[PDB]
Symmetry: C2
Subunit: 230 residues, 2 copies
Amino acid sequence: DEVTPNHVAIIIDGHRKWAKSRGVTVQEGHQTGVNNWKHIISRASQLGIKLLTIWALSPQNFNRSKMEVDFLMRIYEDFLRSDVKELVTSQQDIQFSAIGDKSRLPEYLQDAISYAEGLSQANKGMHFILAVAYGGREDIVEAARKIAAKVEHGILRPDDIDEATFEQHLMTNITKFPSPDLLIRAAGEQRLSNFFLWQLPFTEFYFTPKLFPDFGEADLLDALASYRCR
Amino acid sequence: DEVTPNHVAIIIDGHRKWAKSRGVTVQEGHQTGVNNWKHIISRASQLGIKLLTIWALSPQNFNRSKMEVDFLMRIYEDFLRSDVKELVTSQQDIQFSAIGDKSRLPEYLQDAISYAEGLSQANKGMHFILAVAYGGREDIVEAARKIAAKVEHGILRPDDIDEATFEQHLMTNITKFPSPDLLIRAAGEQRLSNFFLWQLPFTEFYFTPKLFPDFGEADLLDALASYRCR
């Protein structure tokens, strides 16, 4: 069917709030959040979505405490070594990529990343993108930098720059569905917090108050039913 | 106070729907919409907002019927010759600019535009921007084109490109508040429809079901009270 979005993107949020409300640590809030991901991914795959993006970490998130960030990077490595392995080797045959500024991540996380990308490189199922150390402004700036370098080496002239060319130098140039059809944001806030910007001119937004550690397959289903009503 | 946004931007929508529901023409829907603007602007000025942007016309809107568009361009000229004149000459001392691709507009509208900009050029009150034939993707592309031209003439090197430099070549480079603090969208839809993109990484979104011809000063007040609660 076509009333199923090709690209669904998710802003996760609410881990601290949820931890707080449950008299629990933020590390446990984060871990339970991340444990939801595999079911979210399988479900998106089952629904015939071609691309699911989960926004795991912004470049501003590097401003949180070092303990918090280091815990997160570890949880992400566990996710890639455990759950992603299963997803990409299962009959869902998911293809895995990460986007963002990877050289800002610890080398252990960079290696879990390229391992899962290598493992799934020729799979044919749903694309799953983990956006880590990704920010929308930075993506646009880096695209413009790359284009500028090519202009300086004679490869491109200023008036050859159009949307399509701009689109080919964004970090989303790994997909043919760069622009999400549907953007979901958990935890109640109605803003982008420097996620995709270029990619969002026509995307439908869906805001739930649900804190992300409580966010399940049903909530993805609810986002999709909202999308179908529009 | 500081819990009052510096920049408020408005996506207007619902004119056809409203016309329809009232057994009336779209031209009358549009005209009643535009008549709301002056009260919206005075009120924003009274509230101490430093910049109010109204998104009057996208480059995609050029796809509607020629009669519809021509009527709109006329209504906009009437607005600039009538209401804006009053706003900029009153004690609110509003400064007027338009942004967007102006050379796509009829010459009569371009002239009403530069007349109101000349008339208000040295006013010191709230900035009012009318975004006409403006689109967020196009703004970013044009910024990148300009930067690219400067790279080709030796004026700039690729690694000199950063947010700040990118920001200076956007159509919003006429303000020091390019990024809206609060984005309001009438008529129920939850998406940007190719309005600002670069400018929105942290802006708060506020969606009302109110059709824009019914949108008044109270609705701006409601958007501001939402913003203060966040």
